[PDB]
Design an enzyme around this catalytic site. Sequence first.
Site, PDB file in Angstrom:
ATOM      1  N   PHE A  62       5.721   0.041   0.412  1.00  0.00           N
ATOM      2  CA  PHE A  62       5.564   1.299  -0.315  1.00  0.00           C
ATOM      3  C   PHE A  62       5.459   2.395   0.738  1.00  0.00           C
ATOM      4  CE2 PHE A  62       3.242  -1.849  -3.099  1.00  0.00           C
ATOM      5  CZ  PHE A  62       4.365  -2.138  -3.852  1.00  0.00           C
TER       6      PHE A  62
ATOM      7  N   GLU B 150       0.267  -2.235   1.117  1.00  0.00           N
ATOM      8  CA  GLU B 150       1.577  -1.944   1.719  1.00  0.00           C
ATOM      9  C   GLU B 150       1.747  -0.455   2.017  1.00  0.00           C
ATOM     10  OE1 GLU B 150       1.543  -5.525   1.941  1.00  0.00           O
ATOM     11  OE2 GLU B 150       3.496  -4.772   2.602  1.00  0.00           O
ATOM     12  N   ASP B 151       0.759   0.110   2.725  1.00  0.00           N
ATOM     13  CA  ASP B 151       0.724   1.506   3.176  1.00  0.00           C
ATOM     14  C   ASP B 151       0.812   2.504   2.023  1.00  0.00           C
ATOM     15  OD1 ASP B 151       1.778   0.094   5.880  1.00  0.00           O
ATOM     16  OD2 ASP B 151       0.862   2.024   6.385  1.00  0.00           O
ATOM     17  N   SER B 152       0.131   2.223   0.915  1.00  0.00           N
ATOM     18  CA  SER B 152       0.038   3.179  -0.175  1.00  0.00           C
ATOM     19  C   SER B 152      -1.178   4.080   0.026  1.00  0.00           C
ATOM     20  CB  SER B 152      -0.026   2.456  -1.518  1.00  0.00           C
ATOM     21  OG  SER B 152       1.268   2.135  -1.992  1.00  0.00           O
TER      22      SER B 152
ATOM     23  N   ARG C 150      -0.388  -0.496  13.147  1.00  0.00           N
ATOM     24  CA  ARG C 150       0.203   0.707  13.719  1.00  0.00           C
ATOM     25  C   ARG C 150      -0.450   1.095  15.038  1.00  0.00           C
ATOM     26  NH1 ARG C 150       2.609   4.469   9.584  1.00  0.00           N
ATOM     27  NH2 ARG C 150       3.074   3.177   7.748  1.00  0.00           N
TER      28      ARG C 150
END
Lengths: 226, 76, 198, 243, 190, 749, 123
Positions: free
Chosen positions: F255, G106-108, A28
């Site tokens: 997620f 996974e961006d948790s 990001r």
Amino acid sequence: LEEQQNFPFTIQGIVPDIVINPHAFPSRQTPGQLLEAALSKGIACPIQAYTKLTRHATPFSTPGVTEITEQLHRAGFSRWGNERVYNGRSGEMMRSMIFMGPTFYQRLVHMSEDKVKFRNTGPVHPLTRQPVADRKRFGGIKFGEMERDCLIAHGASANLHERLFTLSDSSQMHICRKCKTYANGPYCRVCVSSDHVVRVYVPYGAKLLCQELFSMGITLNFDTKL
Amino acid sequence: RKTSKFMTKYERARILGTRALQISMNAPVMVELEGETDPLEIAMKELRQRKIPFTIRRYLPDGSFEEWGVDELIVE
Amino acid sequence: TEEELKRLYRIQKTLMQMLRDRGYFIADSELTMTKQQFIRKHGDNMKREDLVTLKAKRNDNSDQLYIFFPDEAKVGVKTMKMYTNRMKSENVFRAILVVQQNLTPFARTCISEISSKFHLEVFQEAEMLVNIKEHVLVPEHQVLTTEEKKTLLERYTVKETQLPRIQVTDPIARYFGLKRGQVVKIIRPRYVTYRYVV
Amino acid sequence: FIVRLSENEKAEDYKRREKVLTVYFLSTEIPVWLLFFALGVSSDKEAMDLIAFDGDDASITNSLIASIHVADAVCEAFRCGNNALTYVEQQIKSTKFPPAESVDECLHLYLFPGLQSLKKKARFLGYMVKCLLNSYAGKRKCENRDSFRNKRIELAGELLEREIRVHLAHARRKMTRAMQKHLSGKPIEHYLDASVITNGLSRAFSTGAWSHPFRKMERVSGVVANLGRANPLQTLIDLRRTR
Amino acid sequence: LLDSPVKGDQGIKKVNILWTDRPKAPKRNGELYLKVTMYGDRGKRNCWTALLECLPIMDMIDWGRSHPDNIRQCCSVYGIDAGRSIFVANLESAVSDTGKEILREHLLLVADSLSVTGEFVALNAKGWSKQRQVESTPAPFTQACFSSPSQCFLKAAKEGVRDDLQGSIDALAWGKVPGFGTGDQFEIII
Amino acid sequence: LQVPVGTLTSIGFSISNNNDRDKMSVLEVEAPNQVTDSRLGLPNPDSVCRTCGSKDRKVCEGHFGVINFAYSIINPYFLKEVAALLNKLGIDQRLIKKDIPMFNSLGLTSFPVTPNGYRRTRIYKKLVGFEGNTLELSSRVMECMQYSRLFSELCGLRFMKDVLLGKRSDHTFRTVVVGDPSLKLNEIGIPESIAKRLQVSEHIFRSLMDGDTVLMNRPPSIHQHSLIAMTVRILPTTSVVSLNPICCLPFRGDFDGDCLHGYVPQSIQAKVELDELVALDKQLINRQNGRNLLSLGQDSLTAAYLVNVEKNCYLNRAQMQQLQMYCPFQLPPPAIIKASPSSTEPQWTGMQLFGMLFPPGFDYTYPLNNVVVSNGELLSFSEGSAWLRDGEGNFIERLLKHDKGKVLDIIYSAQEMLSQWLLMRGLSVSLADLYLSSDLQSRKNLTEEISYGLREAEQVCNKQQLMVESWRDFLAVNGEDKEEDSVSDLARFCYERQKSATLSELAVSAFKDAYRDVQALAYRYGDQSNSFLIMSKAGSKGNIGKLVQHSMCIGLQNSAVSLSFGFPRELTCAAWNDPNSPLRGAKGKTTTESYVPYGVIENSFLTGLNPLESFVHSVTSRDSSFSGNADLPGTLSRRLMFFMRDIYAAYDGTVRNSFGNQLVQFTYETDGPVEDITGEALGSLSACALSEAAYSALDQPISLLETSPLLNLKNVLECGSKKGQREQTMSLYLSEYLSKKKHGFEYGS
Amino acid sequence: LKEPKIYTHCELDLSFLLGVSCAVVPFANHDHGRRVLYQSQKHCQQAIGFSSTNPNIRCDTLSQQLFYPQKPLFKTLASECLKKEVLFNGQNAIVAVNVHLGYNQEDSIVMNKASLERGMFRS
DNA sequence: TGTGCTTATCGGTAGAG
DNA sequence: CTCTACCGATAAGCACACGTACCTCTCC
Ligand SMILES: [Mg+2]
Ligand SMILES: [Zn+2]
């Protein structure tokens, strides 16, 4: 949702509140969250003269790294904001120092219990007899063209017959045998009697297209086998 | 009966689905079951033991067909 | 007239290569002749008239082919009728005319009218400058006979219309003189395939 | 007052096919050199000293020569007397909806009303031609719509009055059409409909369809919007938008 | 006379010399090549037939490997199976340009499916209707579901055609099976 | 009343005449002031239908009713055909006018109305009265018939795609998904609150329990592996579902709030063939490239890289026996008896821990990273990647080629053991990773090296900009007078680079290869314990181009769109206030109209950006967030699937189409060993492999001369337009005999 | 401004060139340009924070408010010259950057369950 | 918002008395 | 010598799509 006894705890007994993955940072490309954490940590830890302290976070006049690391070093911590923690599940020390610090997070309005759209048997559409698209009711999930096209390639035609005819809008159509018109129980006005009338199982979309083609002036002849 | 000599997975998944629907409708199993209640576990054993009376009408694109047997075919 | 002769030598060489690839018994003296053997050995003031020849097939000398070179462009009804009468009086079947410019629309109907006996294939002078079969992109096109077409249709048990299709407008179907209803064997550089002329 | 620089479609004998300077005033396309000579200018020398170019180009001088030729061909002896004003009057009077005023007075309140004298608006016309020739010659950049220098915003002082006016124009038409039926065989608070403005403003505020600035029908959508009340930052940035 | 050329021909826009490593139409057994861009011929003459008249310089250009880059002009000059190889060489270069790796057997099926009728048909409704008009297999319901139902149903009713329900949409819209994994065999015979 | 059950075979499309228009309508009405909503109306205000028995809008079919007119009229679908016999009672050419066109459907004297269930009525209730004006009765008939939903002005294709093609179904659910690495790969975590209310059909209705298969899907279906049949695992959570993070690569999601809806099968015939063709045990081979579908994630990939490249962090017996509880295989020999004179316990290396996942009969060899596996023992490895990632010769593909029966628990045991080891170690990102230096002098030397590398790259671009046809007298070896006056033009070169499209295209490539040495400074100054370098060498997330922008400098910032302003080559306060700058507009060098933006940012994301540099970065990054031109990978995939979804493989060995059993290919390609593809739809999986590359492609152009990789695929696939733009680009080659001279090819070209 | 007297104009602050939702973000020129555009536009309107000091005269369809709203520890100049505490909608938590048993892939997000039931992030 | 398909209009060309 | 029929550019008129899932608020 981890318990407090399982978190990697700091030597002062301070357990973290929200643990995020380190992999989200190179993709990001967000530096400054760690800088905000290192600034808010150096603000909140006591100095062992609290005046002339770097409290400002004005965007286009941000202080440098040497002004944040020296403030974090004067408080009695490491310069890079990382602290030696111990594993809460076993007690053993970790080989690397984990970055910690207070960071202003937000809670969004998108919760998971406002997205549940389960359905067993509910109301149908008045026109096409399809399930509704309202989450306040039982609703339903649209088996689109792509979910049919990726199920065609798998060779699964048993679920493709269920999710398009059985579990979807199913109806019944009566077809005359000697005649070739749609017979409305069943009675063929062209034929002498309803002695040879067969019934095929078609979805409601086929009848909705048939009654529309007859509305626009196109009749259909149906050749059946059994 | 001179087309492929091997049972495909697409015909196998339909033969097992037919046999499970038959056993679920209270049919006598041709194979001796030893402590089992799932119909798919009986259907896979009947397919692996070649004791099922089904015939495959393998249609051809020209218009004809080739009627096969399950015991004539082999499963890997 | 040197540029016209340099064009016409390539036209004659491509025509001889096409007739050799079709199987019409082209001699070795006409296939490997250079520019010197085309100018000094042959005539000098030809005016597109000395190129008219008659070739018979190698397997049978009854099937003849007359190559017609017109004296002028935009040929019409009179000269096409004269060529048709010349082809009919000599009892030949297939003719090949190499015109320069586009044909008139009144002369384009006499080919479709008298088409039961005479089959006049029209070739442009711009299309015969570069050989089509002598390319790295074009594969080997083998024309199958009726005896091979019957066992090919009996092997896969297919119909005559259940095949990949080519058209008569394509230059490959015009290079071999393929009529409608024939099956061509194509070998790709094995994996072979078959087409159907429509 | 639109002054274009395009090819000569009018009176084209398939040979004189160069660019020419024409204007678009009161739905009447006249050559610009007739409009120069109709207002004060009596010679071609002082008409070229007004359009100060100070350059060396072949597409400007040939276009000016073509404009002089199309002004001398469309009107005979236009450079002597007052023959240009007759052509200007006949071109405005031949329109589909001409003004009822005289053409000698239409050049004082329609052609550049911010200027007073009839000779000064000819100098402003020469300045407008000079800017067009400098933009055509590459010595001047055209106006881009993406820049905020050539853009003005309107929040409520122009958006609301342009919807008040299109309802007042209907209230003034629903008043004469009801007073004509009661005049040839009453108070003033009977013919003036007071609800026709309120029911229009409430509908424009509810549906969002605001009046087009350069049209009458085809109402645009996206002028008004609802406020968000989840946090005070959303209603602060909702009052701070420009579309 | 100012817009008349003193060098070259009139109908050629720009010619540039490029170096390549994996070129189309490879040789028998890295090289330099030219990319000629020609103007659109308003007449009936083709651009290749005007490029061939290269009459002063004919032997310096390898005419056994030169080909137009457009597929529709390649099948009009060298045949459909010679433009098919250019279509495969362009598809394998356009798939690998997106950072993806695909098998050649998936491209060799699209290339043999878009060239069944002798030419590369369009991806729109006209190109799909031409493949059915050439092969003489009427399918009104799939063409109706493709772009326009009414404009196809009117022409189907005015001609008196009959749909045999051979496709997958025609089977899945009236409660049948398509016939690829389930539908091309029958175990009902005991 | 019991009618037999048949099967529909063929449907004929014909135009209805006046003979069946009255025979199909039941109880036709003729009064003008009569709706007659008693024999043909389902929502009518009555008690039951007079045609049907006891109707409740469920067992009653909509009946029709004819409206008989007085006189006959020409059918409005034939007005374009009767103008062909006339130039503007033709018994001479009457035979061609009734054979192919239908003659009985030409006279129109009646017109039926729709039933009340399908509603519209304000026109059909007005042309029911027989009056005059014969030439204008068809003007009302053609407007009453044009109110159909098949025409347009849910109309047209929107009716078809959402009634016949796209349908909704029951026994479905849709919940937000999270991650749970404790579950198996073929198991989905269904909560106990939704599974208690989800009913299935078992031979009566029962609730959902463990072991039942359910077909999951993540919208949109990007390819055929987005539909995985997983078994239900009941979890004590609520309002959320969970699966392994390994299976996010078939689903192509994260997620993120991204929902994932599932379909529950009811019949047993659909349940048996669900876990036999659609489940994860059958979708092991990726159909696009023949490789494995599932691979390592990011945490498992980083922990597998770090356990192999360290080789100095040894584990004891109590840690090895703890990590062995998640491993399927037994314990190896320790291989370190004494590492020190004070070592009182045998230690364990890092590569022996990763070797407990391999079977004893497994052999693996990767020559690019010196990976040698023999007898189930990782023997050698030295500074390499891509053998743990997705590739042609990875160890997961060789494990799938080895047994393909017990790999789904090997990947699960690896994801458990590597997550335990990485928790024992600890991975973090601190400010020392962003600083990329050890002290202040190293950072000062790094900044002094970046400030000279960018100045050298600017000179490289200024040198490469001279390669045009205008400087051929200067590039040749001669005596030039302006050789000292052409090099000092530092701003004129930047102005000329932005005004044209080819000089910027030859300078972007001249900056991007000179920046490869500037990007090579993160390995000299950065340490081996840097988290960004570890995550970039492991290939899990990020690369060196992200680390250079994080630490040293952003670099080249350019856009592929022609704007009306340029960049002043300094990005300082004095460059913004310059009146003769390309940022304002026409610099006057005669005016300017368009620019191609080209700017280099000397600062980075760590030291902070200038407001002019932030404006430059915002202009160059605005093109990446537009959400436009997104209809191309949808309509291209749809038009590719309509052309390919009917192609299959026959039993005879040929590749047949479905429309008339027409031949497409005679045999399949010989690139695969498995020749048992005789019942698969090859065209569908061939179009899915192209559409999956079509969605995952860059939708932004590289420059003004080239195009996007999506548009390049669209122009190749949609190449049969047979017209357009009159370009006709050719490509000529050179002969073989031109190489007989010195530099003969260049002279010939 | 101090050394060269050749300007004749000056700005009040460089951070006042942004909006009210963008000038309050700390280190805004340090982040990526695509990531600040999310926070200043979408994440600022969805962040649950202050709602109203009078919920009795408000009958809006939906209203949400945290129990313990908090102002941040940093001090931007926009929030210092605006004197508005409602510009920040959220609470600051002790955020650690670490892996937690593969539960944050996974961006948790892995959060403390014990701190959430003490009053943190409760609305 | 423009791209694609079909149809009317117009100039140039050729056979016949 | 003229009279009459057929073809390839040149505008003119009309249907074409805007992704796939879902998710509310406000007015008709
Ligand atoms: Mg996401
Ligand atoms: Zn009824």
